[PDB]
Amino acid sequence: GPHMSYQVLARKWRPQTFADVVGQEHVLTALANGLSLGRIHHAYLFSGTRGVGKTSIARLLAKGLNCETGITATPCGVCDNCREIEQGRFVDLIEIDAASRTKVEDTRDLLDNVQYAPARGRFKVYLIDEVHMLSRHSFNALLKTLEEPPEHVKFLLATTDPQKLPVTILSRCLQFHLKALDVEQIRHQLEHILNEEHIAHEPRALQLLARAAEGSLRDALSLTDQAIASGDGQVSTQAVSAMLGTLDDDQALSLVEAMVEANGERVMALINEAAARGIEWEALLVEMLGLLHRIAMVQLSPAALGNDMAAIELRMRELARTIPPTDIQLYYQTLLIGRKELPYAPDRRMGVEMTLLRALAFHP
């Protein structure tokens, strides 16, 4: 793609217009309507998940704010000021890594920069990434500035855990929540990126990568660059699947699936995988116990599946609907007994293997 392929797909591929953003349609539509209608809030807090675009959206909104063509939902192409945000630096757009500059003094300097006029753009736009890491006093200063901000100053805050922001900051910020990307959106964007990179790709590898991304597009892009690494400039399904298996840590769920199914060779293969990964064995037993307990609770009531396990919903459903509660009870008891007797074993590996052997031998 680029002048020698060192340039990372994650950073080279970053939206430059609102249309290049993958379907975070909620915030994009609301912000476009606000910009076009003139309804502007003092602060625009952005949040959501890692690698779903909150910093990209904030940068594009700053470009739209400070573009010389006017407050537009569509920043233009050349517009030298509107270009300075991407290539080079823009004077009036202040990008702060609030994680690097959490101190009230570092933010004090910029909040004293607030009252000075913008050089070129209309608005002294502030992009404060990882806003949740500012100290209590930095938050106090930011709030004090947010009470009465001048008409030439707007704040753009991005974070992953808004719960650490004070309610006083949240009341003055119109938070825009970004939802984790779907597998279809991630797969389609990866397909487009690889097609425009002239990279040979197999359709199934993209779905595997998207499923492995866990909803974050940047995870998909990093896994994609790594998959190109594992190979010679081609994203082959076999190479991608082998890489994913190497990176795989979902051993306990597969172990429960294979043990309930009574698949001894698959169980032993999964135990070999968990051994080669240097995975703790007591942790493996605890994960299997938790999975079985959750399966039982789902069998009692479908609402037992929270949003903490959205990656493994379907499998859980499949295991809860098809396995009677008696077998789950027996397996939970067997694994509890095995974990109780794990310390007194030839080694943890043999203890876990024997506990799973007992669970298989039950065949209930």
Partner: protein
């Protein structure tokens, strides 16, 4: 003083402005909107200069006294604001609040913002001296049985058309989260200038933010609503609530339930309720719960609760939230297995 809901505040402000305004309650949104309305009305009657202070043990009271007594070169008609701390008017703060109550004047307007005041604990002195010529504004979060009509009123006053389905979806995702609920209505107005909100429109542009307290979880358990209780439990897990607080909050009502079910063989539940000093709204749901699969879940659930308590209080890895799911499912007419109960 004049005790007032946010509904009539405007009217009262049109009637006149008192010496001090006390904005109290647990709802950030209601307090914020009340403060904005008070400041706008004050500015209409010449109160131009504003100030802010956080009532803290480290605050500089001398600045407050100096600005309240002295006047400025411009905008003599001045207003002052104070954020009360989380606990409230601490015993080291009541005396200085009394001094402010002496250091006031008709030129200044005082705004008092903070959580609800335990009037049973704190009364008179500061309270009555303001009550002389002041306004109290109660801004508390509407509960679940009251939220739908509040959201309907807000939609009507913002010129939106909410049906019952969108109203209940909004009341589902945002509880104790009136600030984000109002922001959601504003975002939905931004998304569609039509102003007509249907089920899919709100359903797409909504997040399950919510905010619950362990009392909500215990009430959901007493009503025996599985999905409601599990949603509350997930919400307190994501919010980062300490599970031991949940344990104690459930334990109090669970031991009360055990006592009531044991004593109900000799005494009707009414006299038991009177004996234990339990309130009427609590009385209804506890009477509903007492005759809902009792005498088996009340010892099995105590067994599981003791298991969770000991597991939580010996190690440091916690992992008790699934056990709390077990409790949430046992007390909601969904019998569990002895395997997970005993352990």
């Amino acid at each position: 003083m004049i005790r007032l809901y946010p509904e009539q505040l405007r009217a009262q402000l049109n009637e006149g402005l008192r010496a001090a305004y006390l904005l109290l309650g647990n709802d950030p949104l209601l307090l914020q909107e009340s403060q904005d309305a008070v400041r706008q009305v004050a500015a209409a009657q010449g109160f131009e200069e504003h100030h802010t202070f956080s009532i803290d043990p480290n605050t500089d009271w001398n600045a407050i006294f100096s600005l309240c007594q002295a006047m400025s070169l411009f905008a003599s008609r001045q207003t002052l604001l104070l954020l009360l701390p989380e606990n409230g008017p601490n015993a080291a703060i009541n005396e200085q609040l009394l001094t402010l109550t002496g250091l006031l004047h008709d030129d200044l307007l005082l705004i008092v913002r903070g959580n609800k005041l335990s009037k049973a604990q704190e009364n008179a002195a500061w309270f009555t001296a303001l009550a002389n010529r002041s306004v109290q504004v109660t801004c508390q979060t509407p509960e679940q049985a009251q939220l739908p009509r509040w959201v309907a009123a807000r939609a009507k006053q913002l010129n939106l058309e909410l049906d019952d389905a969108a109203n209940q979806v909004l009341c589902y995702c945002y509880e104790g989260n009136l600030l984000a609920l109002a922001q959601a209505l504003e975002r939905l107005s931004l998304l569609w200038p039509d102003g007509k909100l249907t089920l899919p429109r709100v359903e797409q542009a909504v997040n399950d933010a919510a905010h619950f307290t362990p009392f909500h979880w215990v009430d959901a358990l007493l009503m025996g609503k599985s999905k409601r209780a599990l949603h509350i439990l997930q919400q307190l897990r994501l919010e980062g609530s300490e599970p031991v607080i949940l344990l104690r909050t459930l334990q109090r009502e669970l031991l009360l339930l055990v006592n009531l079910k044991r004593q109900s063989a000799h005494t009707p539940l009414r006299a038991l309720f009177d004996k234990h000093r339990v309130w009427q709204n609590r009385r209804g749901m506890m009477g509903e719960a007492l005759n809902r699969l009792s005498q088996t879940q009340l010892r099995q659930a105590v067994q599981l609760l003791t298991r969770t308590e000991l597991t939580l209080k010996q190690d440091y890895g916690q992992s008790v939230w699934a056990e709390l799911e077990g409790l949430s499912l046992l007390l909601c007419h969904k019998p569990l297995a002895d395997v997970f109960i005993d352990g």
